[PDB]
Subunit: 311 residues, 5 copies
């Protein structure tokens, strides 16, 4: 089999569509997601044209091997898609309608800057390489782009599934390649991070601040050091759900900043004890009383600054 | 091969059945389960009619490639099922009896609201897409729906395996689709959560309340902070067995509430010490004595309220 | 190809054997094990009989596609076995000797009641479904059942590999089914649990009891709470190696009971301090002295009771 | 099919190229990375030469089975590559242009000496074994070596993808072998290690040094022992992200050295308490005051020495 | 195809060789390793003999399906090897030279008694089964046994790769089987265990011994209990890298013994406090002073005894 020959010098237009059936396994660390969908293809092959009257049929059904089919691939996949051809239908004028159901693991970078209050644009890049006898270009049939209502991505809200209609045409190894960008817009369900990580982390921090109403150095050391260790556990927990980024994430920034608050609280606890031992408690009392206001105030202002820089 | 021709104008009815052999790997985080079952299919293909006198045999056995077989798929699977055809029996009128044994990983959403005292309805959706020559519709042969007595799903009780007899017929990408809903009702075996998570979590909480019978601030700080950290470990343990939900689970609610009890216990311990240092122990004694009753009472009432909201 | 025809009205007897080459990956949580073995099959096919002096050959070697082979499956497998046919030998009378080497992941429930001092009976269920032409029944050739001397299952002792000679013949979806039960008896190597979990857990518990020879409340709180937290770590460690069970395991029972001992030790430490503060140390001394005997005595008796209920 | 015959006695030159489409899963522990790329091959086959004037065709397209194709393999792969032939084009002089898209898991050793400030040279070794008829040699077509602009390896910066043009020709099992070295130069994005591991580890260490401004032995023991345990947690965390090396890594060296600082701080805290108890606090005061300078100074100098030895 | 006929009554000798290309994934817990190698086979088939003059060829190449090839298997593999035939060359006398490249996951038991200072002998068992026509026997062509210089097994040193030249011929399922033992001798790179596990474990133990220079019970309890808990963390860490063994490993023995040292240190700390409270400090002083010598001395001697029993 060979590609449909051009009537003039035109590139062959392959109309595409992706209909999402299942979305699952969005892996943050790996920056992948799994997809199960219909891939539809359509193109004109004049050599396949027929007269409905003469043939006694209005449609012709072929097997993939019987006819020419464009070699369509995904750019951003781990391995080649697992595909099963569902149908191939030819209209009297040689308009081919191809339908396959496929499953694939897609590589798509994620921006963790606003984590866990982040939104992402996942991409599925469709591609075709031109042949010596014909230049092949891709198009989007909007009537064949969509998603099942039941499509759910655990821990995420699905906003939209659209295609950038104009392909990105470029030369790769002296041949034309035509690339389409299918975009799946999602927003993270931040809900669970509040009772599981955010609030517990704030509670232990506020517990460290009770040391500002205590003259007991031994109890203070216990309050600040114990809560710091629990903060380390939360830091470790958070970093296990995320890849290593060359930038600070919102949560990462708060987690990092909280260490500074623990460090300064230890200085205060030390300074207070030192002065007490040196028979200067009036002074220690001034530092401790100031700390009761300064710590929550600087914490609130630093958080307003951070939220402003990130959102 | 092409579909069987209609005698009048009716759609082709494909009778289905699923007989469960094995159920395993119900993954809560992934919201999947693995299944090993028999899939039975039955349809009339008059082009396969034969005379037992001429052919010698009363029933014909065919290889899948030799005849037309409806392209039946599962909607909610990760990858296409691993199937092995067991038998294809054709009777004189052309009635085909198809039997395959398959294994598949099924995507089925789980409601964790009542976890670990939750029940689920797992779904296996059978589907067929219509062809141009003719419309294909699915039906349930109740005599061919069931499960092996030995079918066990580790950590769950299997209640029932039934099929919604009426298919959901709908248009998808300018063609008819016929969908059947097979339902596997299960209930979680909550037993182990009691000695492993619930009771240990209650013991550490009650241990923190011994601080209400102590005037030693340093010991109190140790009691409340240490048990809080152990509570964080249980919170982390619980959250590793669950996906992130956009709602509160029953266990999550109790776990979250317990933090408030630890936070208020630290306030009480702080207030008590502060008053004792300020030479007001009579007052501190009133707060501590009230706390001995208030903490278990408010804990019991808050739990009754939570159990009521969730069950 | 069709099944061999009956001389009278007899079912076709397929003689079976399983010879274990490798046993590996007994996964307690998943309740699975992997197996690599020979599967031998034997049946009479008269259509294949030949003269030994006329043919020249005493035995004829066939390719699987050339002859009829019974469709033998395993009931309790995750996916269909990976099989490679080794040899097919036909004797003059038409006795077929089939041999394949296969690998499979087997689902077999485990009884954790006596863990880690438990024994298990792993099952490999062989099955055949009858055809319209004739009923197929399974038999065990004991000469062809066995295991390689080098077969080792890490963490287990292999006791025996035997087959229940009488098949379970039953109707399933209007056809006969013939099931054989191959049993692999194993006993857990409990050795490592003693220096790694049992003894460390006992050492920390005995360390908590040193609080009965101390009047220092602050030190006592540290002894009992610290050791309790270490006990929680062991509880978590143990539960990660096990699935969730709707019953108590032996280790689970001991682990759970030890919490009660920590809880009562905290009460004792609290009561002791309270009395000391109330200027009643003589009394506190009576409770502490009684505790020195009561705690180890009740611990020993409770363990004798538990060992009796479980063994 | 057989290899193209030599005109004289020359070896057959197979021109190669690798164009990277996707780079993912650089696993430090496993010392592997996954790759999705184009593999291009070119060689002259005179048996395939044709006349362009009479044929009217400038190029002929063949299926892999129709013609002789060199058996090109990767040396350092886990399993054989998953390949899909994209195109085979023959020019009138018989020059064959082969293109496949493949995916593979590549074994490539990593040097962790400077971790997490390390750079690596990943290798993809292309190989061909000579046939009895003729010797096959590999060459690099630089025009067909490259990478997609969007190629991202999570946690790494991609510097260059080049090929060592001169193959390594050698005898292996009495035949010639022709090996090409494709090099992917990468540098680790160390950013996240600073707020997540380095700084937290330094904060806890500096917190242990507050014990040099405290006479409270009980508080000092708590400060040094608690932070030491947090240091053990960071040591464990770091070692989980790395394989075991027969050399010290930069981070490993710092982590190890920090233990010595904790050990000496415990000695100091012990010596200080001992002297205080022995009624020699003036002396203890001299040791403690010296420690306030000595500990940060020796820490800075030891780090300068280490950075010098490693960079 | 059938086996080559015997000239007299001799067995068919299949000469074998294994050339290691890659060694990776030595999994201690699973007792497996992955291998990528060349498998070479050689035997005489008279039926394929030719005259060089009338043929015009010195060697003849065949496709695996065209000729008889011995069914060679590996005994100790998880699944059947993934193989790709590289070459099949036939010389005039009909001597066949077969070469395949394969990858396999090999089961090979490990002796952990001296861990992490252990050495292992990994085995790759080659096997062939005899046929009714003739007995097939294996031999080693030493010229075709070897390994690539670049073969590295992460965390191990490769010593040698040799074959036991004499096969083990025995009957299995009424056919003779010819087994060859290929041995890969390796020694563990213990280096990293020293700064990561051994030394940290010794440092915390020595820190517990500072309690012998302290009269503070509260501080002593903190020193001994805290370090004990850190020892439990190291015990857990070590046991995660190892399978459960029915014997004590060298590291396991040291780890277990260290618990006894912690237990006795708690007794000493308790006894010391008890005597001090009972107004007998002179005595407590004698026990504490003796402990300062006894603990390190008994620790050194117990370690010499253990090293002697294990090495
Ligand atoms: C420690 C500090 C506590 C964390 C503060 C919340 C983070 C935040 O401020 O989050 C903000 C996001 C909203 O994001 P948005 O509108 O999607 O972003 C796009 C914004 N632009 C386009 C304007 C730039 O979430 C919320 O609705 C906050 C609800 C969570 C409350 C948690 C309380 C604990
Ligand atoms: C910490 C607070 C303790 C937790 C309270 C138990 C939860 C509960 O009350 O659980 C209730 C569930 C029963 O649920 P059901 O009949 O399946 O639900 C459907 C109910 N409708 C249809 C009426 C709405 O389990 C039990 O039988 C309780 C036994 C566990 C006791 C745990 C002791 C600790
Ligand atoms: C904490 C309490 C300590 C644990 C007590 C040992 C458990 C036990 O009693 O274990 C019992 C099993 C023996 O089992 P069996 O004969 O196979 O059982 C079948 C018995 N029937 C058929 C009679 C019912 O192990 C042993 O040989 C015990 C040796 C380990 C001692 C561990 C010391 C710590
Ligand atoms: C705890 C001690 C603090 C760690 C010190 C930083 C390590 C270092 O000095 O890292 C050095 C590397 C740069 O390395 P380079 O140029 O790639 O190496 C090749 C060099 N030759 C060719 C000259 C040999 O990273 C940096 O840019 C350092 C920035 C991180 C600061 C960390 C703050 C905490
Ligand atoms: C806690 C106590 C410290 C551990 C003692 C070292 C273990 C040992 O003694 O290790 C011994 C092995 C050497 O063994 P070999 O020659 O391979 O064995 C075969 C021996 N035969 C044939 C004679 C029986 O390693 C070494 O080179 C020791 C270097 C490690 C130093 C540890 C620093 C801490
Ligand atoms: Br693809
Ligand atoms: Br082009
Ligand atoms: Br103080
Ligand atoms: Br399917
Ligand atoms: Br107090
Ligand atoms: Br099977
Ligand atoms: Br007290
Ligand atoms: Br390859
Ligand atoms: Br002191
Ligand atoms: Br094999
Ligand atoms: Br034999
Ligand atoms: Br004391
Ligand atoms: Na085609
Ligand atoms: Na068909
Ligand atoms: Na067959
Ligand atoms: Na304390
Ligand atoms: Na070819
Ligand atoms: Na063959």
């Amino acid at each position: 089999v060979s590609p449909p020959p051009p009537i003039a010098d035109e590139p062959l237009t392959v109309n595409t569509g992706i209909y999402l059936i299942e979305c699952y396994s969005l892996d943050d660390k790996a920056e992948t997601f799994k997809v199960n969908a219909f891939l539809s293809l359509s193109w004109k092959d004049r050599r396949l044209a027929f007269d409905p009257v003469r043939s006694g049929v209005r449609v012709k059904t072929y097997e993939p091997e019987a006819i020419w089919i464009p070699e369509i691939r995904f750019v951003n996949v781990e391995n080649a898609r697992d595909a099963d051809v569902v149908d191939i239908s030819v209209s009297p004028d040689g308009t081919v309608q191809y339908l396959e159901r496929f499953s694939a693991r897609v590589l798509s970078p994620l921006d963790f800057r606003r984590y866990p209050f982040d939104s992402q644009t996942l991409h599925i890049y469709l591609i075709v390489r031109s042949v010596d006898t014909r230049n092949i270009v891709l198009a989007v049939d909007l009537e064949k782009v969509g998603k099942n209502d039941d499509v759910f991505l655990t821990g995420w809200d699905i906003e939209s599934f659209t295609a950038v209609v104009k392909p990105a045409n470029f030369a790769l190894e002296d041949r034309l390649e035509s690339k389409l960008d299918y975009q799946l817009r999602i927003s993270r369900q931040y809900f669970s991070y509040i009772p599981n990580i955010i609030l517990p982390m704030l509670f232990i921090l506020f517990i460290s601040w009770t040391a500002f109403w205590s003259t007991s150095y031994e109890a203070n050391v216990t309050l600040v050091v114990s809560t710091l260790i629990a903060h380390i556990f939360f830091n470790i927990l958070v970093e296990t759900n995320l890849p290593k980024t060359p930038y600070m994430t919102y949560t990462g920034a708060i987690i990092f900043m909280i260490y500074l608050f623990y460090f300064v609280a230890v200085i205060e606890v030390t300074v207070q004890h030192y002065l007490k031992v040196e028979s200067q408690p009036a002074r220690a009392a001034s530092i401790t009383r100031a700390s009761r206001i300064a710590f929550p105030v600087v914490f609130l202002l630093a958080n307003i600054i951070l939220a402003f820089l990130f959102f």
